[PDB]
Design a protein around this ligand. Structure first.
Ligand SMILES: *[C@@H]1O[C@H](CO)[C@@H](O)[C@H](O)[C@H]1NC(C)=O
Ligand SMILES: *[C@@H]1O[C@H](CO)[C@@H](O)[C@H](O)[C@H]1NC(C)=O
Lengths: 323, 315
């Protein structure tokens, strides 16, 4: 659920209420998509800004914490299963590689040092706050003494976390942790999760998904090095083209210059974008498919050129200057 | 047409008559190497290594015009696409193949960074450029007219490939190897590699020419224009003898230079390409530009690229 701040008495907007136990939310502004984690169903899902486009990016046995790096297009998360892992992948979940798997019992409060490209997290059982490189080569324990530190956030040169025992919010220097002070008094209840509201410019990065859904017939996820198309989890889908268009995923998709449309039927890539409907689906000549004029040197924009024929490029279609 | 150190002459194919049909092209000093013809203009193209320049001259000797002077040291062959009026030559010293648009003497370097190219030939209808590199491991290579796709069609059992001849009637590339003393022919894809019967005294053949059912060739050690049947060989007949440093044997025929192509379209001269038609297989064209220019957003026109292609200083 969400509540608008400047909305007076706001009632929590009920979205994705079907999930069971779950304690993870992250919203990517770049693509305006939520990354609600369905721990009960053991799957990390992505949702639209209103929650319409539901897609399961990845499935994790015990997913609790979620970190987004839209500029780098990588989805960071942690698994509460045995031998707890900081599993990292793209926004499309291309490479689910556990960043850190040793010396971790119950990871929580994953945070990302965007300015310094570092990974910070806490562990309630370990009662320590550690930092690591995005790959995980380095590993430094920023805070050694803590009491059930559960939440975490980072901003400026300070790192903020919450304690379930003392029921208060602390602060420490992100580099070392020298200034461990208490930011609040003994709160009546236990503070679960702490986040930073970056009213100022956040991690802005041009969204590849902006241009015609990033060349995707379906949901788009702006991962590293260009957009990464996504497909609905409810249906069985296979990405077409260079992993771009979700199909019925029944197989028998023609390759080479006979790209298969979104329906599954394939037509020649030369036949594609012929100002007609080669497939039962317009995918053959779909907009995204025919996004820009990058005509091959071979073809004019001369087989039927200027020869009273409307089978060549439209510029030379029946425009025969020789006649 | 046979090119020799002393001069370049054209003998009739009939054995009875032995009178030059073209004005012999001679000079002092001269090391003529490489020849080509233009049936429509009744003009020949030849390279003189002594003068380090490529010239053109009509068969009657009316006009002798310089074709290229700069960046020319050792031109060893000439390929002329009659459809696009483009002349291709191999400069061994620069180890590169260059194409000149004869309509305006616009110059462009296509296939380049080679080892020791010796001959070249351009097939307009098939849109293929065949050239020979005798540098061991010697290889017979093919590429598109613009030099796009370089492909070693033949790279096995080649010692010294010297001359290439295109049998336009049967669409087979006949070549000559001086190391193994063999005349072999394969498809344009180099599939059907059949070797002719052993030539009687062939030791260092250099030239070749396919006319009718006979396959003329030149041998340095013999110093003669030996004729054999293109079928299997035999019938060794010395057309001429005693030539000093006999070399290429480029042939002449009106029927060879005829027909349509990707170019030669009434309102698409060179396929509406600014400089180069460069016909490529499957009856298509790729526009080309000189060294100083490049293809624009629309590939039809040519635009200068000083940022990537600074002007070439003369010397
Ligand atoms: C997501 O949901 C919205 C609202 O139903 C719909 O308009 C849109 O096409 C869906 N898919 C994408 C790719 O946004
Ligand atoms: C000869 O050329 C063909 C086609 O490029 C290639 O597959 C083969 O490996 C080459 N062999 C040699 C002798 O280089």
């Amino acid at each position: 659920s969400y509540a608008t701040l400047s909305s007076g008495i706001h009632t929590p907007t009920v979205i994705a209420s079907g999930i069971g136990t779950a304690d993870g939310i992250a919203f990517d502004w770049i693509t305006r998509r939520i990354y609600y984690s369905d721990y009960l169903n053991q799957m990390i899902n992505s949702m639209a800004e209103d929650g319409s486009n539901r897609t399961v990016i990845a499935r994790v046995p015990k997913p609790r914490a979620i970190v987004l790096d839209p500029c780098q297009g990588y989805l960071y998360w942690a698994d509460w299963d045995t031998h707890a892992k900081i599993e990292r992948a793209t926004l499309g979940g291309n490479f689910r590689v556990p960043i850190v798997n040793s010396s971790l019992v119950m990871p929580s409060g994953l945070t990302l040092d965007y300015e310094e490209d570092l990974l910070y997290w806490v562990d309630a059982s370990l009662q320590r706050i550690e930092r690591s490189t995005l790959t995980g080569v380095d590993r430094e324990v920023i805070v050694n003494a803590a009491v059930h530190a559960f939440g975490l956030t980072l901003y400026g040169q300070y790192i903020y976390w919450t304690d379930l025992y003392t029921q208060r919010i602390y602060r420490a220097n992100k580099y070392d942790g020298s200034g461990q002070i208490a930011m609040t008094t003994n709160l009546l209840s236990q503070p679960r999760g702490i986040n930073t509201v970056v009213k100022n410019q956040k991690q802005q990065c041009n969204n590849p998904c902006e241009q015609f859904n990033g060349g995707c017939s379906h949901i788009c996820a702006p991962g590293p090095n260009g957009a990464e198309c996504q497909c609905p989890h409810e249906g069985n889908w296979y990405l077409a083209n260079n992993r771009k268009h979700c199909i019925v995923d029944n197989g028998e998709r023609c390759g080479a210059s006979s790209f298969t449309c979104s329906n599954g039927r394939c037509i020649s890539e030369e036949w594609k974008c012929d100002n007609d409907n080669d497939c039962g689906d317009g995918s053959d000549e779909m907009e995204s498919v025919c996004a820009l004029h990058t005509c091959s040197p071979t073809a004019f924009t001369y087989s039927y050129r200027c020869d009273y024929y409307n089978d060549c490029g439209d510029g030379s279609d029946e425009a025969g200057c020789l006649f | 047409i046979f090119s020799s150190q002393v001069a370049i002459r054209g003998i009739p194919f009939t054995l009875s008559t032995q009178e030059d049909v073209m004005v012999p092209v001679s000079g002092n000093p001269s090391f003529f190497v490489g020849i080509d013809f233009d049936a429509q203009d009744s003009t020949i193209f030849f390279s003189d290594m002594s003068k380090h320049m490529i010239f053109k001259q009509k068969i009657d000797g009316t006009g002798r015009e310089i074709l290229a002077a700069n960046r020319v040291e050792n031109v060893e062959s000439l390929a002329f696409d009659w459809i696009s009026k483009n002349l291709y030559w191999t400069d061994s010293h620069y180890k590169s193949i260059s194409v000149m648009r004869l309509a305006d003497k616009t110059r462009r370097t296509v296939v380049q960074y080679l080892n020791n190219p010796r001959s070249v030939v351009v097939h307009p209808f098939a849109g293929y450029l065949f050239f020979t590199d005798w540098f061991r491991p010697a290889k017979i290579m093919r590429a598109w007219s613009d030099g796009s796709h370089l492909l070693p069609v033949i790279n096995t059992t080649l010692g010294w490939p010297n001359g290439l001849a295109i049998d336009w009637a049967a669409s087979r590339l006949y070549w000559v190897d001086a190391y193994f003393d063999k005349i072999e022919h394969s498809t344009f894809d180099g599939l059907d590699r059949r070797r002719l019967g052993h030539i009687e005294q062939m030791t260092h053949p250099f030239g070749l020419a396919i006319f009718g059912e006979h396959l003329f060739f030149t041998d340095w050690r013999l110093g003669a224009i030996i004729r054999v049947r293109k079928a299997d060989g035999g019938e060794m007949t010395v057309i001429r003898s005693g030539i000093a440093y006999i070399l290429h044997l480029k042939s002449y025929d009106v029927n060879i230079q005829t027909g349509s192509n990707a170019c030669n379209q009434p309102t698409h001269p060179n396929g509406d390409c600014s400089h180069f038609c460069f016909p490529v297989p499957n009856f298509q064209r790729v526009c080309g530009c000189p060294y100083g220019m490049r293809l624009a957003s629309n590939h039809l026109t040519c635009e200068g690229d000083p940022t990537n292609e600074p002007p070439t200083e003369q010397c």
